[model samples]
Target: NRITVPLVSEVQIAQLRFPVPKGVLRIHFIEAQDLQGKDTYLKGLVKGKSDPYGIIRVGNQIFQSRVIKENLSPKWNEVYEALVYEHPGQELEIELFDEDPDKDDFLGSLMIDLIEVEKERLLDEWFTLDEVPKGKLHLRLEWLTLMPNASNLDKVLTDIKADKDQANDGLSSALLILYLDSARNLPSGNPNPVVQMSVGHKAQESKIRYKTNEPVWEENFTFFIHNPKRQDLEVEVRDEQHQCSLGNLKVPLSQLLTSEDMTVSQRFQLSNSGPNSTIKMKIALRVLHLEK
Candidate 1:
């Protein structure tokens, strides 16, 4: 006897719609108004003002505002731009903390729906703080899209005022995304190995792969490239416990400019290690753009 055929439905064939984020979020931490110290109590009976600092989180990206000592109203005026890849289920989270000698005290937190931010494309308002008795945090958020066309590059250069004289300042016009795959031919006796990668003043590390000569990280990292023309990505494979460098390599950014989609993928021979040692990586560069 033949088995009955399973039912097929049109609903099962429907494609799912997920948010394709192709932009950077420009977050301006304006100020915090009327913030009372969580460390103090009894309504002005306690002594010190709050040394307030804020931690902002969106997906895996994290940013911190500088501490403002002894202030009820602290004006940070600090700006941070974070890359946005996918935003459907993510939310922008802000936690305010009062710095202390021993332990930091929690002031408040704010969780914003990123879908709302994507729809509005701009948000400038004072959001009431949650999980605390009282306080408010003012923010200005902007979405900057990534443009593929290079003609807009001149406008961006002019707008950012790309002056050679004032180039030492931390102004960035491009973003670099890196994917670390694996390392091979690592020295013996040191089982745990980790990768430390840096460009300019920004640095990031990959997770340690334990007890393996051929370690696979498969991790992604992003860096804001300031003056890519002169920058070089420096990467080091190190022993985690010993804090000793095992192998290292430096790749100039100019090499990626010739590749299609500004991306490069290959295995590079380690400079400071054995002759056969190498590391595999994939990297891409994207210029930042602001929509008119």
Candidate 2:
């Protein structure tokens, strides 16, 4: 029932409660420019460069970029995604390091207040390193806001060069938010209900609700869809202990394309189970986009 936050001071974590995240932050770590060479030999007479790397932290999540040898300038062109649980409090942190024999030497570090990005919704710029004489980092940060728009699906498919794998298996076009509410009219010994859901290749699992004739989960799940109209969400309700099936259903996303607000909440009739068995769920879909 709780999401994990790592490497943060336990004291501050206790001070602030972990609420649901605000949005997704897509970090494009492009390069490091004019970094100070920390690895050197021959006592200032002969000079050598460094094998530099980058460490990126958003809230409690952290990422390490690959190493680049013998250069003050390095390019990563890497991307990372992290959720923003709290905006005014949690800041983005970046540290550049020089890989060495004994210990990694610090090149530079940067702290970014995310409130500005939330305003602009997108940022692409070079940031100067703090507490160090000479270093600059090239970064692109995007705050993705999920909202439904009918034609938005087609626009995402046009962003061809942005994804490595052709837009088919590539970047997502929409974000599907699903909440499992409850279930009723099932066979029991309190049949340990667990729900598994998948939209396209991405899957999500609900926590096991133990020992009850009627079970309530109310668990949240999310999936990225390449093309909403072309995909279907498959949900399977199962007995966790005995590995027996309770019910399963396949929901076609195409139906919601013209629906109001692109949202729906309903109880579905389960197939291959009791006649009255049904699962209740609430689902909402939103297009993923970044403004030019």
Candidate 3:
């Protein structure tokens, strides 16, 4: 009897690369004071009331603030959370605009280094805008570390005011994570499958899979979820080639509350696509609890 070796290969592992996600970037888009009035009438004799709104961007993810009509000094009081994968090369970009019928006038612009915010953890500075004369934007930026346990949930709930019956329109109470594994039996075309996720007003976009029916994304995304019982995770799979949706699914966040360790892993059936089509995912919800 002769013993055969299955494999014989040996090489020293040299280098490795991994993206270290820093933390959640939370922004309190509080208000802006003395913004540029972009409206003009009567040949510069009259200064009309301006409708101001804010456009915030962190890499490919973009968020827009509500347009406060007819006001130079506007109070948005909105909140946005973004997952920061790389801090050194990234910064928060904000551009203020006046909502008009056709041409939206540029009010101001502000950019902040994420590296600085990461060091401080939290900042509530009023920043002076560039290309904006005398306009100051009130921003409270925070770098939130992700905790694996629910021990800090109580204090976080209190801080975000999630229990005062604000119900549908309150601040977020939990941070939900979606782990994308792979897709099965996608339809025709290059596919280039990209998953877009939305929880109410907040949305998280996934990376493109390039060209494949069965794609291995293996990427994770995070979102700030408000009233998990009331909000649903809206998932839409789209083809990058045609910019068309292949399928969409709505998963209620409440489904995870009763789940094992507040986590779920399964292949969800994609709607509006092939009957055999599905996407494998691992979803986990962690309450926003700050630690000492």
Candidate 4:
């Protein structure tokens, strides 16, 4: 009997390339625990309001930042964690640049972009495919410098409290919309003007003057999503008004090759990134598969 030998090729395959993710980058918290397993994840936990760099002040100088969003994460360090569809020659590239460099009131501003890939032409390229991700990403600003010897820091906060929009050059509301994804909840009621001024002599038709910037009183509320899928989703001090959804995700388990009635809920926290700035639903995903 004659035995045939299998031919083997000797060539290393290159990794895949992916598109840079959009929106404010997240800063993840990773922990250290030497172990050998498939489902072992770790990360650091920091409140968006607790971090120092998360704050900004506008005083005598233009000490403010119209932060679009911080690239909350830096480079990563992981070894052979076995991702989805483990294909040979995969690569991930990190991108960083300023989305807007024109107005720099706050420090530390950089348009951060990142990608994850394993093939030459992969579609999805952001998250890990092995387990659920934890914690929101962060960005520590270092660009906009604070007012040296500037007083009334609390006053700035007060002003922000009084009128969040005017506090940051009128971009406060916009930033919150992105940070909190709460634009959908903006005050729909008619606006009210506060603090008026008049040029020339008073009385008879002085130059029309009244600073339109008025503090918008926000009303906290609570609501529940009755068995949206399984558990009743409870939202506190948050209404549909301020909770704007970036979008919904429906991920499929290709291996199972089936669609399942799988549901997910996203949680959020207000960030210090903007005035009355709350960080909620920075990003999220829902996985569905056949449970056989």
Candidate 5:
């Protein structure tokens, strides 16, 4: 006897959408040509020109560009790479700030929709800054897809031009995952506690746990490791409301080189903080390789 099976409907298949491909997003900060000075703090006293720098954000990742001193039209010519696992609700945020001896002055900011960039695969254009009078930022964005075949690894190494002397500047080959558990014996009088993790210029922050000295995060974060041998993971516990650091720690990734499975799970004593304060976390590194 033949078994009866339910037939698929055309309407249900029509409602489904394909997933976006995962890749590395490379952003080129070409320059800010013809920008007007917003550092009018000392309007008539001094030159009042800007020593401008930029802060770029993608999700929780943050990158900073070098400062170009005393110039209206500055050419940064800096590039940043960020991993894109998903881009449905993510954006690329940029803020320009003018350096000062007293305090930094805000210049302008820009936000770009990533979904459109994924659809187009590349974008090279000049964008006008928002919530400001006048300025333009030039950008070039490219999506580098993860190769599924190892045959292209040689080509990639050549493209990036990985030299032995410049090992710090090589392309990323591994991903680091971190799990923040909780903090203990933290000092009192902090309104909200949060964890900020950074590798080089890329930073990520966890959600705030309000009004507690002993806060539990139970969160996961990922980072791209260009050269794990030279990189270190930095963690900072901060009072979010007051914007002050409570404790901090730095773990050398080179230690994981000798570990089995490249994993570390332990409690680390936080430096530059109150007595007996420590944070528990688990971190692992995985080398990315495409199969033939």
Candidate 6:
């Protein structure tokens, strides 16, 4: 397989010390096509004077177009696919709209994904010659969803909040599941690792909890505790909104890390008189890195 750049974000760029040798690294783009649960397709006049929704674009650095197969008019409640190549140190944004040159630009949705590449040596003899391959995993993100009110003019936002029925609209979730696998073992597919993330809904500290499948992994940490001894490390998160309030959050431990935007390796210490020797910290994991 050919060498490719890994998806590394700007925040992660600091930890690196060396430069990527000049060479041809192919960066492929994977288009997102799920409308979550939007039952109807959004078409018509493209809203306002803007042209009807045209092809959805991924990022400015790459090219993309709507993947329309059948249906004379495409509905928003479907999936589309596309591919592209991106260069190093370049980031891309995703957006949707009707490309009607003569009409008002009916806005769809907008999102972003960052791409970077890194090289790693084979650790275990998992493949032939125990050689690790270089390639990119196309990531499709379900960032923001544009819930255009049909002709009700009440606005999706107001309808969702004002009426309890809107909550049951089955709009589904904006969360997208992301997985990582080896490029060489592409066709056969490998278990690799799976992680879930959401940029749509705002989850509070109380709603945060480690994954049940792998509690030890600490996938989504909302609160942290520290003690000098084995006090109460086990935790229970309550209140899905006001996360800090003790009534809202119930933890049997010392200190807690409640901030939602704390960076990795950014340690916060707690001074407490406890019998435990090991200190524990909680995280509101916004970003994570997985390496083989």
TM-score per model over all chains: 0.63, 0.79, 0.61, 0.15, 0.51, 0.19
Q: Estimate candidate 1's alpha-carbon lDDT, on a 0 to 1 scale.
A: 0.79
TM-score of predicted model 2? 0.79
Q: Write the residue-wise lDDT of candidate 5 on 148-187 in tens digits.
A: 2233444544545532222224456556777888998777
Best by TM-score: 2
Q: Report the C-alpha lDDT of model 6 over 23-61, residue by residue, as the tens digit.
A: 221222232232221123665643233222333343332
lDDT of 2 by residue, 139-182 (tens): 88888766676666676667624544212235566777777889
Each model's backbone clash number: 0, 0, 0, 34, 0, 28
Kindly report which residue pairs in candidate 1 clash with one another: none
lDDT (tens digit, per residue) of candidate 3 on 1-292: 9988888688867643345446677788889998886544456665776999989998777888888999988988888777777656688999999999989989999989888888888898999999977699999887777655555656766677643321224566677888888889888846899998899888878888888888887777777776666789889999998899878788998888777778899999999988788999988886654333
Error of 1 at 283 (Å): 1.5
> Model 4: runs farther than 4 Å from truth?
1-26, 29-52, 55-105, 116-230, 233-285, 288-292
| Candidate 3 all-Cα RMSD | 6.9
Kindly list the per-residue Cα lDDT of model 4 for residues 1-292, writing each as its tens digit. 9999999998767643432212211122121121111222554454232111222111111132222343334222211111122223322221222233453222232222223211111121233212213222222211111121213233433432553222211211000000112222112232221111111111111121122122232212111111112222222222232343222212121211122222122333322222333223221112211111
Per-residue error (Å), model 5, residue 161: 2.2
Name the 10 consecutive residues with the lowest summed lDDT in model 6: 121-130
Q: Please give the TM-score that candidate 3 achieves against the real structure.
A: 0.61
| lDDT computed for candidate 2 | 0.79
Instruction: After the best TM-score superposition of candidate 3, give how far the Cα of residue 65 lies from its true spot, in angstroms.
Output: 1.2
In model 3, the worst 10-residue window by lDDT is: 162-171
For model 1, residues 1-292, the per-residue Cα lDDT tens digits are: 8989999776765543433347788787889998865554455766676799999998888988889898878888877767787646788899999998888988899999877887788888998899988899999887766553333545656756633222223556677888898999987745688999999779999999887889998788888877566799999999887788888999998777667878889999999887799999988877776663
